[PDB]
Structure 1
């Protein structure tokens, strides 16, 4: 009998929900992601920005090697700070630039000790003494509080931004503002399903909403347009034309951009032109009988254009089918049965060609970020198509078997949402640490060419990066462990800025303290990514083995070291890790580490990619889906129906449920469902009547439906990806797929089969 995930979620919800958590204490253990509390800074960066797998590190390499807890930090730097919480301050140290430790080069933060009357300070990270520069000098007070320590946000806060001076800029000239390039696949596929005109029509609408800082009057971001079908059509949209000009480039193989000026333009100046263009593109290609297309030469071009304007930018590519047309970048239609113990299964998660990896390199090199809206209808080799956006720090939206009368809304939101996203460009992040350890590994929508500087062509409030630490030397139980996460980037107003997150953690030589300070959600997040990146180098049986052997080894160490003497028939878990065997099982149960029958490679590669980026908020939900009961729903006044475990063993034939994992949202109806509900909710009298196929939100009724809609609304609200709704008839219908999201069930092995499997290897090791 184990503490269920939901018991644990709700417990901590009770204990800490709707209470202010203020980060003023080193090594504090923030609430779980599944708790909506209020956060106040006061010292250590908000857990909305950063969470760790332990908030108390081990102090010796051996001790860590003993417990086999991974030390790691999930970082989501540009996370959306909620309305009722404090915004980041923008600190500005003048011409000199932000103050820094001379040796580690750490930025002025609260972990900087002032000594000798305020003349000098000693870095917390490296224990080196720096001279306080004249302009920045101030008087220590009673204890060196350095009067002003509550006034200046670089001295008292965990998170703030620095204003970046010119030596932080490419070529030491102030960076230009970015630009969005909009790129449409106008082949036959996409003229038929009605997609192209959707994209052109809505956009007319959308462009308006491009973001602009509050200090400026119009967005400084320029906009350009290209449409391709195995040949690339560029459009001129300069301010002075009543008609837009088209210039086709047919020499793919050595692509180039046919113009300078007229390609990227202020939307407002060139408004009328652009509408006239966007009016015409759909018609323009109406009798296109073309079938094959080209992909890489499109990114290639977009990148070359942002190179030529000398600015960072974001590519908005809308594409349909496997690019088969002969150009560099061709992808053959090959999928193979090399995937159980093959040891070559890794070839399936890699791109086909060596051009995608380099191209990704070219983009990051020039601050170009590509985003891909993909509308498959057959194998598309997402392993290759989605490689560039992932390394380039963009997104992959994939809409299988898209149909205009269903997923039109899914698509339109994601485009709306991706445009208006707060964004940063041409960023490089690096995570500094106190004496005694260093970041040795990274996992994200990222690209690294040395071992220190995480390069991210673009970054949004949604993308997160997990950072794995190992041990250099030794950590003191006096100092604790420090992290300073610092991100160089370029704003949409063309300013170089420096976001800085500082965290302070405790350290300890007592193995007890290690396990007391763990976070499951974060540990899962590290494991997941660590595993998923391994997919590209090792066999999936070797991967899973490493995962189980390190799960047991964790509990086995806590058994034989901090476990009060209890019988050998028991499995003793600490409190931070009640639910870790459960979650760990679900990770291994997920198709990315599992087998072919009934899943495409595409669905596997898509999943493999999405996760890497994920925050801790998102990686929680994706592996342990939310299952809401709706038949028992209260009529009014309550935020949501409490959650229920993810097993078929909580389903009622008289019932109506809602399951979401962050990408799919299922609405499920028992054969015996109460037709009263079936009429308010769907407006049809009989379970018999309703159609799985007509998955379009339902218009009418006010008693329920509305209650249902809102909660689904409550459900969507913080997720980046609007979720495809999938109605499910209870028996003898598709539910076969829905079943797969019932994660505590068997389907590999169930929760009570892995909890059994780990206790075998736990006892394999004894004493």
Structure 2
């Protein structure tokens, strides 16, 4: 008899929702990502920015080796702060730059203890003593409040931004504003399905909406244009041409950019010249007959252009199918099937050619990020194409078997949302820790050369990096554990800037405390990324072996050390890990860790990358979808309907339901679905009148439809991807795909099967 995932979600929504969470206490434990509440910085960093597996580290390594609870944090450095909460403050320390500890190089933060009248401060991290610089000196007070503590943000707040001096910039010189390079596949495939014209016509409108700060009047971001089909087609759109010039490069293999000017021009200046091009491009390649394209050189070109302009930039690549034309990065159709019993199973989740890794390194080294809008209709090898846009901090948008009358809106919504994304450029993150522990492993859309610096060519509000800690040395129950995430980047106006997040966590040597301070959602996010990364290095049966046995070991350790004595017939779980078994089982049911029968690899590789970028709020939804009852829904109640368990056991034949995992939204209809709703939603009289293949928005509707659509909008709100709606009919229909997302059912094993499987190895760890 287990408390469901939903019982917990609502129980925490009731006792913590609608209340202000203040980050004052050290090691405080925040509400769940599912529980909406107001957050005031007041000392430590908001959980919107950074959450942890445990908000109380084991004081020593052995203890940590006991419980086998992973010590990790999920950092979303640029998370979209709500309108009602205090925005970040920009701190300037003059020519000297931000005051830092001379040893561990931690920036000035609330964790600095000011001593000796205010002339010296002892580092909260490395306990090193520093001299307070002249321009920054101030007198202490009764116990060292110093008197500007509530005046200066970097002394009282956990989240803020520093201004970076010239010694923080490349070549010690002020960086240039980034550039958006739009690159379009123009082969036969994208011409026919009307995608090229769609991109062209719509890009006229959305080039206006290019990000710009309030302090300036017009976006400093420049724009460039390229097409390709086994050959590159550059364009000259200077602000003194009545007609755009095209310069075609055929020397693929030794690519180059044939222009320095006329490329990358302020959109407002060259407005008429640009619109002149976007009118022509659909007509220009209208009768194109090419069946092969190139890819690596395209990224190579867009990267080479940004190096020449001496500026960072983003590559908005639109591609259709598998790049086959002979070139570097030429891909084959290597979907050989090897799995489960094959150790070399990993290769499938690896790029074919060696050139992608190098290409990715060159991009990150020059501040170039690539975002890929992909429109496959066949094998495309996501493992290869997605490598460069993953490592660079970009995004990947895949639209399986794209059809205009259906997936048009989905794509345009993704495009708009991606252009308008608040984005940094040429970013590098460094996670510093207090004496006793350190960052040892990282998980994100990132690339690393050394073992300390996380390089992200671009980072947006949605991206998140997960960090793993290990024990450097024994900890202190008094001082605890300190973490400082520092992100050095460049803005869309070309300024060098530092964003800093400080978080203080308590240390205990008591195994009781660790369990008490555990977040299940955050723990899952780590295990997901850790396993999904191991996929490229180990057999899948090995990793699972690891997941189940580490799950059983945590619950066995809680059983034998903290739990007040109970029967052997019972399995004892802490309240923090009430629902850890259920979620863990869903991780093992994911196709990423399951097999090829019934699933393309492309789909396996796509999902594998998707999770690696996720934050806690997103990881919670993808693994345990939201299932809303729509038939019982009150009319204009009109609060969002309560969630119902992710199984077929909660589905009624007289019922209409909505299930969402953040990427796919399914509307489910029972066979005995009440015709009153089917009319007031689908505008057709009966059940057998609806067509699944007509999965477009049914805007029309007087009472229920406005009402029902409503709940579909709020679900989408905090979500970066616009979801592919899929309407389903209950029997022998496309229900087969829908059932996969019912994660409490068998389909791997079910929930009660895994709970009994954990309790067996919990009794195998005898004593």
TM over 0.5: yes
Deviations 1:169-215 (A, max 9, x none): 00000000000000000000000000000000100000000010000
SS of the residue corresponding to residue 404 of structure 2 reads coil
Deviations 1:620-659 (A, max 9, x none): 0000000000000110132310000100000000000000
Give, in whole Å, the separation in 1 of the partners of 2:237 and 2:275.
10
Deviations 1:296-354 (A, max 9, x none): 00000000000000000000000000000000110011111111120001000000010
Give, in whole Å, the separation in 1 of the partners of 2:489 and 2:99.
18
Give, in whole Å, the separation in 1 of the partners of 2:664 and 2:386.
20
SS of the residue corresponding to residue 560 of structure 2 reads helix
Q: CA deviation at 1:280?
A: 0.3
Deviations 1:93-115 (A, max 9, x none): 00000000000000000000000
Correspondence for 2:523:
523
TM-score by length of 1: 1.00
Give, in whole Å, the separation in 2 of the partners of 1:538 and 1:89.
45
Q: CA deviation at 1:701?
A: 1.6
Give, in whole Å, the separation in 2 of the partners of 1:240 and 1:339.
59
SS of the residue corresponding to residue 555 of structure 2 reads helix
SS of the residue corresponding to residue 162 of structure 2 reads strand
Give, in whole Å, the separation in 2 of the partners of 1:144 and 1:575.
39
Deviations 1:682-708 (A, max 9, x none): 001010100000111002122101111
Give, in whole Å, the separation in 2 of the partners of 1:32 and 1:207.
38
SS of the residue corresponding to residue 699 of structure 2 reads coil
Give, in whole Å, the separation in 2 of the partners of 1:44 and 1:514.
20
TM-score by length of 2: 1.00
Give, in whole Å, the separation in 1 of the partners of 2:260 and 2:488.
29
Give, in whole Å, the separation in 2 of the partners of 1:425 and 1:120.
36
Give, in whole Å, the separation in 1 of the partners of 2:290 and 2:520.
51
Deviations 1:23-62 (A, max 9, x none): 0010000000001100000000000000000000000000
Give, in whole Å, the separation in 2 of the partners of 1:97 and 1:659.
50
- 1:163 is the counterpart of 2:187: no
Give, in whole Å, the separation in 2 of the partners of 1:684 and 1:756.
47
Give, in whole Å, the separation in 1 of the partners of 2:592 and 2:531.
9
Correspondence for 2:694:
694
Correspondence for 2:453:
453
Correspondence for 1:643:
643
Give, in whole Å, the separation in 2 of the partners of 1:572 and 1:358.
50
Give, in whole Å, the separation in 1 of the partners of 2:233 and 2:339.
40
Deviations 1:227-276 (A, max 9, x none): 00000000000000011000000010000000001000000000000000
Deviations 1:435-462 (A, max 9, x none): 0000000000000000000000000000
Correspondence for 2:716:
716
Give, in whole Å, the separation in 2 of the partners of 1:92 and 1:499.
12
Q: CA deviation at 1:766?
A: 1.9
Give, in whole Å, the separation in 1 of the partners of 2:211 and 2:734.
42
SS of the residue corresponding to residue 24 of structure 1 reads coil
Give, in whole Å, the separation in 2 of the partners of 1:2 and 1:109.
43
Give, in whole Å, the separation in 2 of the partners of 1:714 and 1:239.
43
Give, in whole Å, the separation in 1 of the partners of 2:429 and 2:34.
27
Give, in whole Å, the separation in 1 of the partners of 2:181 and 2:566.
64
Correspondence for 1:739:
739
Give, in whole Å, the separation in 1 of the partners of 2:347 and 2:408.
34
Correspondence for 2:349:
349
RMSD after superposition = 0.4
SS of the residue corresponding to residue 737 of structure 1 reads helix
SS of the residue corresponding to residue 183 of structure 2 reads strand
SS of the residue corresponding to residue 344 of structure 1 reads helix
Gaps of 5+ in 1: none
Correspondence for 1:394:
394
Give, in whole Å, the separation in 2 of the partners of 1:339 and 1:399.
26
SS of the residue corresponding to residue 543 of structure 1 reads helix
